[PDB]
Structure 1
């Protein structure tokens, strides 16, 4: 009951992180498509503009700086948004497995329970294998107490981390975009001036 709804918490958390991660991944790669299409255009432009015409050199530098700006914007997005999501969502495969192993080690603890009520149900009916049962149950309890006690504190910590990570991620994007726009703005002006000189 307490778990099943907490695990329930963790799954909605997983599905949500996974939808976000996917959306970010799509965005990155729309940035690459936007980059690509801008590179093609400035090359056609670089071609249709004669090397004799004034500003042909400044045109060369715009095409170049356009590119270094897309590349840099793309790279930083990949680190600061996509990779950060990947670090974040990796936590979910580890936990899915930790919950798989907690489902087992409690089946063991319960059978080493089942087995020690039927080795000790024997006052003088028991032989040698009596402390071997008590040692077993104790190893099955310590195994499950660690995994469950450590799992019981870890899930909610992880659930509560979700907002901080979304916040870090979206400020990182805004910072990158802020700079990218400002820089692109300068080049946009330079582009107009070069053209105005034909």
Structure 2
């Protein structure tokens, strides 16, 4: 009977689009569903941006590694600062890798988890939609049975029970989503706070640690210059 319900639903929907049947107005919930889709779209966009940010960090890392490798190739082992340069180059690579792993774990993964939560809510919104069409389909059938020339009390009674069942199942989903949607909508704030405080914390460590190695790099060049001074 799950198959036949799907046929009566689709028939009700097409009769509504053809101006042959009236639908239950649902403009208030549609505004709520619109906010939900906007929130999910925003979330998906930030998620793709964060993956692109992580990919750009890896590009920055590799180009920095390329410069440091050529510098090590051209830096003679006869020169002062050669051993210190190796430590700078190794630790630079370690900071980039640590930063990439922590970005993936604290920012990209956190965003993936937030975005993945919308899937079950979207399925419930879709189900609520189907139950509302079931209700209008049950009203249309009830009105046709009641308006028939040949009165059939048993057909009337079945149409009336289907009406009642469709109202209750729709209202269960409607009550659940009207409670969940504003709480989910408000939770986007906490999501943005977490993501950007995590990025901020990780970059502060990154700047402080990179500044130390960067200062050592200047000192390596000072040692090289002094060794060859007249």
1:79-99 CA-partner distances (Å, limit 9, x unpaired): 211222222222334433332
Greater shift, 42-51 or 6-15, is seen at: 6-15
**Structure having the higher Rg:** 2
TM-score, length of structure 2 as denominator length: 0.75
Deviations 1:151-182 (A, max 9, x none): 11111111111111111111111100000100
Find the residue that maps to 1:129 and give its secondary structure: helix
The CA distance in 1 between the partners of 2:110 and 2:42, in whole Å, is 15
Q: Does 1:192 align with 2:197?
A: no
Separation (CA, whole Å) in 2 of partners of 1:186 and 1:59: 13
* Unaligned stretches of 5+ residues in structure 2: 1-26, 225-230
| Pairwise CA distance, 1:118 | 5.4
Offset of residue 30 of structure 1: 1.4
Runs of 4+ in 1 over 6 A off after TM superposition: 120-124
Report how far residue 128 of structure 1 moved: 4.8
After the TM superposition, which of the residue ranges 100-109 and 161-170 deviates more from structure 2? Answer: 100-109
Distance apart, 1:65 and its partner CA: 0.8
Deviates further, 122-131 or 132-141: 122-131
Distance apart, 1:120 and its partner CA? 6.7
TM-score by length of 1: 0.86
1:131 Cα deviation from its structure 2 partner: 5.3
Aligned residue pairs, count = 198
Q: What RMSD over aligned residues (CA atoms) do the two structures have, in Å?
A: 2.5
Q: Which residue of 1 aligns with 2:21?
A: none
Unaligned runs of 5+ in 1: none
Query: C-alpha deviations, 1:25-45, integer Å up to 9, x for none?
Result: 222221111111011111111
Counterpart-to-counterpart distance in 1, 2:161 and 2:76 = 88
